[PDB]
Amino acid sequence: MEELTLLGVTQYYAFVQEKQKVHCLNTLFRKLQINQSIIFCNSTQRVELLAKKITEIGYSCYYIHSKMAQNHRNRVFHDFRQGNCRNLVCSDLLTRGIDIQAVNVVINFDFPRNAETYLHRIGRSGRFGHLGVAINLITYEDRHTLRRIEQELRTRIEPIPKTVDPKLYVADQ
């Protein structure tokens, strides 16, 4: 049995053209009541490019990726957990940070290529299952990767509705 679990994380996907990802991301910020959010991309170059664009549209965001130093990643993450930052852009990182209660939305701006990367991004270590929502931005050409990861992880990833039920990601306490 796996250490990380997906029970408690509602998972959605949206069919996006690569040229339209930034626009779809801006639509998500506007239609969801995001407290804090974490956004994954598949390369460190795309992590920095997204973080700058996002701040240009006028959203609060830091970023950490694999080619920063570990002590620098710790302090930026500490600043983000502190509330100094609203969103955090991240590449894939082997060393995970502690859970942040204010993080209720995790977004896969770029879809991971395998199931273990997906679980390492979205899975939760504890069995308390703090309610949250994960949103995957996917191209139609890439839908077969989503089905395979869905079956391999024995989970359910649904097409995102117009209105996400806030019961599934708005903390009720």
Key traits:
173 residues; alpha/beta; 5 helices; ATP-dependent RNA helicase cgh-1
**For the terminal residues, how far apart are their CA atoms?**
31 Å
SS-derived structural category:
alpha/beta
Side-by-side strand order of the widest sheet: 3-4-2-5-6-1-7
**% residues in beta strands:** 15-25%
Tally of distinct domains: 1
- Give the ordered list of helices and strands: EHEHEHEEHEHE
- Largest sheet report: 7 strands, parallel
> Can you count the helices?
5
PDB class: rna binding protein
Keywords: Helicase, RNA binding, RNA binding protein
Assembly: monomeric
Entry title: Crystal structure of the RecA2 domain of RNA helicase CGH-1 in C. elegans
Structural write-up:
The protein is of the alpha/beta class and about 170 residues long. The chain is built from five helices and seven strands; from the N terminus they run βαβαβαββαβαβ. The protein has one domain. The chain has a seven-stranded parallel beta sheet, with helices on both faces. The PDB classes it as rna binding protein. Keywords: Helicase, RNA binding, RNA binding protein.
Summed up, what is this model?
The protein is α/β, with parallel strands linked by helices and 173 residues long. It has helices spanning 21-31, 44-57, 70-82, 115-122, 143-152, and strands spanning 9-15, 36-40, 61-64, 87-90, 103-108, 132-138, 157-159.
Task: Summarize the topology.
Elements: E1 9-15, H1 21-31, E2 36-40, H2 44-57, E3 61-64, H3 70-82, E4 87-90, E5 103-108, H4 115-122, E6 132-138, H5 143-152, E7 157-159
Parallel strand pairs: 1-6, 1-7, 2-4, 2-5, 3-4, 5-6
GO molecular function, one term: ATP hydrolysis activity
GO cellular component, one term: ribonucleoprotein complex
Function: Probable RNA helicase required for oocyte and sperm function. Also required to prevent the physiological germline apoptosis mechanism killing essentially all developing oocytes.
